[PDB]
Design a protein around this ligand. Structure first.
Ligand SMILES: [Cl-]
Ligand SMILES: [Cl-]
Length: 257
């Protein structure tokens, strides 16, 4: 049952470190693509399976290296992951959405054959930090064929996204760049009631929490992508009946349980 299932039965512990797949990396040079600023593809190797794809945007004034740990972590659990560099480090959220859109098309159509051989382009998702998270919400509204969206410490001036794409937002309690009461929580609240949605808020963390290995980001991001990109119900356990001391808030419409 479930053609998209990959990897062993998950444990919490297993989801805080790199997963069972070996990872290869491919550098996409800035000048080799129009529509975004290149970046790095992390993707499984040593295997004949295909996997869903994820495009992920860094945040404000940031480079793709800021999310390298997470690009690798996701890929190691069975995903083809392109972490972009933006055309300019100063690009805003809706610009980042357009470049996510270009990056997804690049992964499907123009990436190396080794990468395309590992990709099922029918199952794609998006994630991003800060302003990249705002871009993630924008693209999920523009393109509802996406399987999932994970905005990390997101920032946007628009607060309402009418999307049917399942959304998990990570806020940071002590974020002063994108205070959750002004960004993350309004985004969560304003999503359609019918859309499966989860908000998790990290105790004591600030805006830079996504820029380094973080156990909670790892668990919630892997689990949401597995549940929606792979239809993998083994990962519902981490997302349902949650009682997680790393969190200082938790909200859900419980559509995914
Ligand atoms: Cl913009
Ligand atoms: Cl398409």
């Amino acid at each position: 049952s479930n053609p998209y299932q990959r990897g062993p039965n998950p444990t919490r512990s297993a989801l805080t470190a790199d997963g069972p797949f070996s990872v290869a990396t491919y550098t996409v040079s800035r000048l080799s693509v129009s529509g975004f600023g290149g970046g790095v593809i992390y993707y499984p190797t040593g295997t004949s399976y295909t996997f869903g794809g994820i495009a992920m945007s860094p945040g404000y004034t940031a480079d793709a290296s800021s999310l390298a740990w997470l690009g690798r972590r996701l890929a190691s659990h069975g995903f083809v992951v392109l972490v972009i560099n933006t055309n300019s480090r100063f690009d805003g959220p809706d610009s980042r959405a357009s470049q996510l859109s270009a990056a997804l098309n690049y992964l499907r159509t123009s990436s190396p054959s080794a990468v395309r051989a590992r990709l099922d382009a029918n199952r794609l998702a998006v994630a991003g930090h800060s302003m990249g998270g705002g871009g993630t919400l924008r693209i999920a509204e523009q393109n509802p064929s996406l399987k999932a969206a994970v905005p990390l410490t997101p920032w946007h001036t628009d607060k309402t996204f009418n999307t049917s794409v399942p959304v998990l937002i990570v806020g940071a309690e002590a974020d002063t760049v994108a205070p959750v009461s002004k960004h993350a929580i309004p985004f969560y609240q304003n999503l359609p009631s019918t859309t499966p949605k989860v908000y998790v808020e990290l105790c004591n963390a600030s805006h830079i929490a996504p820029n380094s290995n973080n156990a909670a980001i790892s668990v919630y991001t892997i689990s949401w992508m597995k549940l929606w990109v792979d239809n993998d119900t083994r990962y519902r356990q981490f997302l349902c009946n949650v009682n997680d001391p790393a969190l200082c808030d938790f909200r859900t419409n419980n559509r995914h349980c």
